[PDB]
Design a binder for this molecule. Sequence first.
Ligand code: ZN
Lengths: 97, 49, 57, 192, 171, 77, 144, 1118
Amino acid sequence: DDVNFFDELRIGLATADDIRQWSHGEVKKPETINYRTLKPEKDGLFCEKIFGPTRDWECYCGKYKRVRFKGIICERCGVEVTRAKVRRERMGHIELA
Amino acid sequence: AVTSIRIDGVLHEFTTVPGVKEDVTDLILNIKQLVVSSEHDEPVVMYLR
Amino acid sequence: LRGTRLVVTSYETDRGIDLAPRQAVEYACEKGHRFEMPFSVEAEIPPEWECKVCGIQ
Amino acid sequence: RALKRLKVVSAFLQTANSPKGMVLDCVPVIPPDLRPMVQLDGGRFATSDLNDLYRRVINRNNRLKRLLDLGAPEIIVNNEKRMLQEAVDALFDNGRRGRPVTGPGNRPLKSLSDMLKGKQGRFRQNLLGKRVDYSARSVIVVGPQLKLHQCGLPKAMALELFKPFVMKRLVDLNHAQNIKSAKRMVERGRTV
Amino acid sequence: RAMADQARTIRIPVHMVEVINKLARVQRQMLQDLGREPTPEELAKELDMTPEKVIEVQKYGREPISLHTPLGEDGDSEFGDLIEDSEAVVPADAVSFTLLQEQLHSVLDTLSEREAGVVSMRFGLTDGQPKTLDEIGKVYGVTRERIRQIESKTMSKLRHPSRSQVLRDYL
Amino acid sequence: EGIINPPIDELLEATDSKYSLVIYAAKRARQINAYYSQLGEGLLEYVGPLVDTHVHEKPLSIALREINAGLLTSEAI
Amino acid sequence: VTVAISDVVVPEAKKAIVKGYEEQDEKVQKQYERGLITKEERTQELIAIWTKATNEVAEAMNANFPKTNPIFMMVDSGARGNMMQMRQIAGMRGLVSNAKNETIPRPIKASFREGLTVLEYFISTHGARKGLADTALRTADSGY
Amino acid sequence: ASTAPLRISFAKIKEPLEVPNLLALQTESFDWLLGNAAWKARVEAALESGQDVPTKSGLEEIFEEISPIEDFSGSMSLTFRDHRFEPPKNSIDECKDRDFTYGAPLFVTAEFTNNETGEIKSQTVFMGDFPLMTNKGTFVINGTERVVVSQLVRSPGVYFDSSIDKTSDKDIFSAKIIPSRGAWLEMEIDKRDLVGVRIDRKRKQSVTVLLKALGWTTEQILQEFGEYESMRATLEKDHTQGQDDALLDIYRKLRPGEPPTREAAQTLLENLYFNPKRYDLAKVGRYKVNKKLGADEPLDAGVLTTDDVIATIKYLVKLHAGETETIGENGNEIVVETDDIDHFGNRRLRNVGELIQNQVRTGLARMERVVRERMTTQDVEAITPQTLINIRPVVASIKEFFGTSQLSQFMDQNNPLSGLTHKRRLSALGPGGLSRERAGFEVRDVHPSHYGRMCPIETPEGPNIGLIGSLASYGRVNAFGFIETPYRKVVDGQVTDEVDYVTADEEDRFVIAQANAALDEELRFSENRVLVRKRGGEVDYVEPSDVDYMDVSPRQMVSVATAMIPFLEHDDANRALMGANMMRQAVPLIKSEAPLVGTGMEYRCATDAGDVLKAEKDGVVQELSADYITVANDDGTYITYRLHKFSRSNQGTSVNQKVVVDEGDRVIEGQVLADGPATEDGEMALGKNLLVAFMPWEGHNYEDAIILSQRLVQDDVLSSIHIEEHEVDARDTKLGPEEITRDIPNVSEEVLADLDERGIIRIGAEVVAGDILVGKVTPKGETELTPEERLLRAIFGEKAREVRDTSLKVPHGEIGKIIGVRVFDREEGDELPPGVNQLVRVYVAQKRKITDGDKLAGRHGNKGVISKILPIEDMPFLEDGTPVDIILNPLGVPSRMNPGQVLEIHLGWLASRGWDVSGLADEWAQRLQAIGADKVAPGTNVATPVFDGAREDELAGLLNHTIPNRDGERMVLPTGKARLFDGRSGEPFPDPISVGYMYILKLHHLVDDKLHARSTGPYSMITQQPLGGKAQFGGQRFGEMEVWALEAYGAAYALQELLTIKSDDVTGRVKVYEAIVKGENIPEPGIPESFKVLIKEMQSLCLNVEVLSSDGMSIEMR
Ligand SMILES: [Zn+2]
C-alpha cells in the first residue's frame, strides 16, 4: 500500500500448492459470455463466483443489491457483494489431467 | 467602406447564384475594392439590381 | 473508437455506512479442511457447498 | 561440461527451490480485466488472444479427462496428451518450438511471454515511459523581446492546462457560485 | 456437434448454429443463381421468416476482432490502444458529486430539526437505508399521518422560488 | 522580478547545497499553505507568513523570501 | 550585410589556371592512346593534377575576397559557414566519388555560381544520396 | 497547344521531341489487361513499326492458360474463352456520392465437353464485377479514389556472383537460378574448390550427385569437364556410383523420413522443377536466360531443362577458372562475367496490369480446385457449367487486393502536381519486394544506369531514402517491364534526327554524347572533344568520330516535379531534393496566380494531370455560367460540361473550378474551358509573387523564421478554404432503436434553435465548439440512482425520460459555416450496412488567412514558419514608397549552397519591370535578338528551362535597360541592389539591399491542426494511463530520455509525480484534482497500476513473485 515499506522484491519457482493457493476457484468450462444476455457464464473464463462481481455492490441473481450488504456470500449464486475492480486482482486455475 | 452584403437567394459565401459567371466568394473580392464615401454616422444601405 | 466492458459502477463509498448483521456458518471437508462463511440473517442455509481449500464437496 | 552442469545442480541444492517445480500439474488463469472482452459501437466484440489459448487448453484437458475414464487405446490417449502439452506450451511461449499458432488474417497469436519481451513489452513501453496529464504540444516561433527566463504560451493552451486552478480562483472571487457554473464558464470561454 | 459447440468464442446453441448455416447457404445460392446480392425481403420470403429474424440471425454469427491487430504503419500501435475505458471514474464528475453531497446538507441545515431529521431518515442520506414511516415516527412518537404531512411541507419549502437556486445547477 | 527573485546565490549562502534548499523551501511552503487552508477554523497550528505578502501570492515565493531574510532554522532529526 | 549574385565573386585568375592544367591533362590522355602507360598510371596522374588545380584555385579565391564582402563577413566573424562551402560556391567543386567509393578522374570545374552541366550534376547526386543515407542510419545507431 | 498563355522563353537549344503522355504508364497497362479497343488500335499500328507486339490481353492469357480442366479419367472437360465486358451500372459521380465501387460485369463463354456422345453446353457465365480505371488513372473503391503504384522487383533469371573468403583470402563463386512462382537452385564453388548444387536451400550436396541422378555416367562427365580441376576433384571425392544410388541419396538428403524408392524421387524432382504447374519462369525469365547463356530455346514455354543446368554449371566453372569468353550453345559468342543486381538490366517493373493479373490468377487457382473437386462427386451428363463454377474466391481476391494492400494507396490530392506525382511513382518495397529495415546501402544509391529512367533528386527524406523514386520525363516501359529511353542517332559525326528507344544493356553497349554540346548549326560538333558516357557509366572525352548516340534534350534525367525549379543547375542536390519534395504539399489558394519566372512545364503538367477541363470537339460557346458550359459542336450536337464547385478532396482542401472562356468565344479541340484547384489559365500556379528583400531585421527572422506584411492579410493573398465532414448514424440496440430527433431530453430551447424539423442543423448556420449538429437520443433503460440525486429529483419532481442524449457536436477548437447535409435512410432503398438504420453527413467549411506559426517555403528548399506580421507603414520601402512584402535572412543562402534563389529574384524583378533591348549591338544582346526576347511589356511572364536557362551575362546586361518608372528612375542599381528606407526610424539604411520578386508557396502544415493541450481526458482499459493521439484529448509521452534528463538534474519529486499521479495512480488522480480545486496540499503518490499488471503477468507464468517488508513478510498488494 505504501511504496516506502517496499524493501525487497523476490522471485522464485511457483509450485502446485502456491498456484492453487493464489486461486479463488477452478475454471472448468470454456465459455466466456452468453450470446443473448451478454452476461458471464457460470464456471467460464469470466465467471463471477471466481473472478468477482461485474456490478458494484451487487451479485449475480440480484437478491442483494446495495452497499449495506457488504462482504456477504449470496447463497443463491455464491457471488460476494463488493466492488467490481476486484476483477483485476483475482486469479483462477485449471487442473490438468 | 462596405461592411456587409446580402443577396436575395444566397445563404453563405461558399455558393453560387444562377445566371452569373462568378461565385459569391469571388464577388466579395470585387466589392471589397469599391471606393465609397459616406457622411452618415450610422450604417447606410444601398441596393444593386 | 468507443468501447465498454459490460461492467457497472456507482458513485458510492465505504465510509459512514453501517453494515447489516451476518452469521458465520462453519463447513468441514473430508480431509479436515474447515472454513467459515458469512450469510445474511434473513437467509436459508443450504446443506452442501464447495470447499475453499481443495475444491471438493 | 561438469562445471556448466554444476552451475545448475548447485542452485537447487542451496536455495529453497525444488526441481519438481519444472513440471506443472495446475495452470494459473489471469484475471479477466487484464484480458478484456469489450463491446465496440455497433455490437462488434474485441478479444485479446489469451481467451483463445485458455479455451484450447481447457478443451483439450476436458477431452482428455473424458477419454481417460471412458477407456481407450493408448494411441489416441497419447495423442491427446501430446496436444495438451503443445497447447500449454503455446500458451506460455508461442513459436519457441515448432510453428506458431495463428488466427484470422494469418498472424501469430500473442502469448504470455510476448507481453514482457521486446521494445513493445511492459518493461520498455509502460513502466519506463508513460503518457502524462497536464501537458501540451505546439509549434515554436521566435520571440526576441522575452527575457532569458520567460516563455510565451497561447491562451488556449494556457487555459486548458490551468483549468482546475482557474476554476478554483474564479469561484474564490465570487465570479461563480459553485464549481459547476465555474466549469461551464471556463468551457464556454467567457471574458473574465 | 463438436464443431457446433467448440467453434466460437461466444457460444451459440446448436439450433441457432443450424439456422445460421441454413441462412448462409440460401444466401450463397441466391447470390450465385440470381447474379445480385439478395435483399433482406427476398431472403425473408425464401426462408419463411420475418426480416427482423433474418437480420438478427445475420448479426449473431459475426466473429470478434482482435485487440492486437496492428494499425501503425511502422508497427508500434495496436487496435486496442485507442479504445477508451468508458466506465472510468472521471475526476471532474467525482468532484462534482462530492460538492453536490456537501451542498445538499447545508440546505437541510437551515430547516427545522424535525424537518431535516425526517427527510434524512426517509431518504437515508445519513445511512443509505430508506426507513418506513412507522420507523421515522417511532423516534419522535408522532403518528404515521403526521410523518406524511411533515414531509410534504418540507418538499413544498424546498420546491419554492426561495431555496431552489442553490440546488438548480446540480440538476 | 518573478521566478528570478530572490537571487539563487543569496539563498545558497543560507544553506549547504541546492538539494537541501529544495526540501527546506518546499516544507516551509507546505506549512504556509496548510495554515491558509484551515484558517476558517479557529486553530493553533502552523505559523506564518512572517513577511508582508500580496493579495494572492504563491506560498513558495513567500517561503523563499523568509528563507532569504533569515527568519527560519533547519535541524536534523 | 546582404546577399546578391554580384557578391559571390569568382577569381579572375581561375580561368587561366584551369586552362593551363587542362593542356597538361590532355597530354596524359594522349600518352594513353599511344599505349605507353596503363590505366592505373593515367588515373593516378589525372587525380594528382586536378588535386593540384583545385588547391591552387582555392588559394586564388581566398586571396580574392575583400574584407568588407558580406559573405566573407559571415565566414570571418564565425556567424555561420566555413571555407569549403565558399570554395564550392565560387571556385571549383573538385573531384567526386563514384557509386562505388572511388574517385572519378574527371573533375567538376564549374561552381554553383556558373552552374553545372548535366553530367556533373548527375555525378554529384551520388555523394549527395550517400551522405543522406549515412545520416539516416547514424540517427538510430547513436541512440542504441 | 496553340491556345496557350504567353510565356517568353530564354531557351537556346531546339528540342526535336515532345514529352510523352505523362499518364500512359497506367492507362496503357490497364488497357492491355482489359483488352480494350485502344489496345487493339495500338497493337494494330505496332505491326510493321516498333514493338508493341503482345497480342493477348491479360484476362485472355489467364483464361487460355487455365483451360482445359480435365478429370483423371479424361472422359470430360471444361473450357473458358471469349471474355466480354458490359457497360457499368453506375457513373463515376454516383459511385463517389453513394459509396459504391466503379466496375463493370465480366462474362466468359464456357464449353462443357464430354468424350461420350460428343456433348457441348456452350453457355455464358458471370465471373463478377471487375473494377475499372477512370480516365485519370485512378480507381473508385468504396467511394474513395485510390492509386496503384508500380513495383520495382528483381527480374527472374540466372545470376552469377563472386566474393572474397575472409579466412583464406580465396575467391568464392556462386550462381543462382531464381524464377517467378517456383523454387530456387544455386551452385557454388567453395574455398576448397568443391562444387555444391544447393537445392531449395537444403543443406549442401555435390553437383556430381545431381548429374548422376539425371542420368550421366562417369565417362561423359570426365570427357566434358576435363580441362578444369574443380570438376575432377569433386568427381574423385564422391565415393558413389549409379543413377539409382545417387537418386536415392538425393531423396534421403532432401526429404528424410522414409526409405525411398527410386520412382518416388524421380516424380518428386519432376514436380519440383520440371512440372509447369508448380514451376514456371515467365517470358522475361526465359528471355533473360537465353540472352545470358546463349541458348535459343523458344520463349513460348518456360520450364527448367537439363540443358540449362549443364550450361549454368559450365558457365560457373569457366568463370571460376578465369576464362573471359565462351561459345554458348546454339550461338556464336558470349561474355563470361558476374552480374550486378541493381543494374536496370536486372530490375524490372510490375505495373497495375500485372499485379491485378496475379491476383486474378490466385483467385482462379482456388476456383479450378473447387471445380475439379466438385466434378467427381456429381453424376455425369446431368450437369451444366453454372453448377460447377463458383465465383466467390475470385471476387474475394480482387476485393482483398484493392483493400488492405500496400500498393493500392489512398490518393494524394493536395494539388494537381501532387496527384500527378503520386502516379509515375516506382516503389521498391511491398508484397514480394524488400522491406524497409532490410535494405543495405547499395540498393539506396544512384546507379549510373538511372540516367533517363529514374530521377536521382526526387525521393523521400525519411527512412525511405532510396526505396521510392519517380519515373523520368521520357521514360517508357518495355513490354517485359524494363524501362527505355530515347536517343538521337548520330552518324558520320552528323546528328541526325532519327530517334531510337534504348534500354540499359543496349545503352551500355554504345557510347552516348551529352545533351548540351556545341553544334555548328550544320548538325555537326565543333569543339572536337566531347564529353561522353561509356560502358561503365564513366565520363570521358572523345573526338567527334566515335560517338554514335546523343541525348534528345537536357533535363531528360529529371522527373516532372524537379523540372519545375528554375535555375536548378545553380542549386545543391540536397536543397533541390527538399524543394521538389516540398512543392507537393502546397495548398490551393482562393485566387491563383501563375509564376512570373518559371519553366516551360507548367502548362503541360496542368493539362496532363487531368484537373483542367478541356473541350472534346471544336465549337462555339453557346451558353456559360459558373456551374456549367454548353457548347454547340460543329458536327451538329450540343454538349454541356459541369464544373465542380466547392467539393472536398481527400486531404480536406477545396476543389473549385473557374471558367475561362466567354459566351461568344470559339473553342478548338483540347482547349481549356475551366481551371482546376491550383491552376491559372491552364498552367500550374501553387503560390504568389512577393516582393522580397534580403536583410536581418531586428531578430524577428532569426534562424529561418519569416516576417510578413499586413497587406497579405488585407487582400487575401494567402487565404485558403478548408472543408471537413462529420458522420453520425442511428442504429438498433437492445432497448429498441436509436432516434435522430430534435427533442433532446434536458437542454434549453436556445441550443435547439438552429436545428431543423428533423433534428439536423440548418444550412448556412455558423457553428462554434460545443454546438450540436445532429440531435440523437439513445434509450438507456431503468437504472439505480444515488440517494442524493433521488432527493434532488423529488425536490424538483422531474422524471427520467429513460433516454440519454448522444448528439453529434463539433470538436473542440473548430468553427465554420455549414455547406451541406446528406442523409441516408435504410427504409428509403439506401444500401446502409447491416444494423445501421440511418446515417447523416455534415460538411463544415471555413476560410483561413495567413497567421504566424504557419509554414511557408520556396522552390529551392528554403522553408520557414511565419513569426511576425508587421503593419504596412513600418516595412522597408523603396525610393518611390513601395513596401516590401516579405523579409528573409541572408545568412541561410551561402551556407546552404543554393544561389539559385538570388538569380530567381533578379530575373523576377527584371520580368516584373519589363525591358527593351533592340538597338544594342552588344554580344549578349545579339543572342536575345535571335530568340525574340527583345521587347517585353511589364508584367510579362518569362521561362528559364532547367539546364538551358538564362546566363548571368544576359541578366547583368538587362538590369541596365528596364523601363523607368513614372518619375523616370530605375530603383534597382546594375548590381541588383536597391536603396531602402527604414519603416520605423525613417532614416535610410546605410547600404543598398537586394530586392526582387520570389514565388512563395503555402505549405499544408498549418498551426491550427498542430496545437493540442490536456488536463484530463479518456484513459485506456488494461493499463490505466492517459490515451494517446490528438483526435482524443491525448497526453504527451514521457519516454526514457526525458527520465534520464530529470535523473541527471537530480529532480526526484518531479519525476515521482510525473510517473505516478499523472499516469497510473488510479486513486490519486481524483484526489489530486479535488485537492487542487479545494485549494490545499497535493497528497502523497501511491503505487502505479502498471506494476501490479506486471506482477500479475509474471505470476501467470508460474513465477512466485512477492514484495517483502523490512522483515520478510509479504505485503499482498491489496
Ligand atoms: Zn445472488
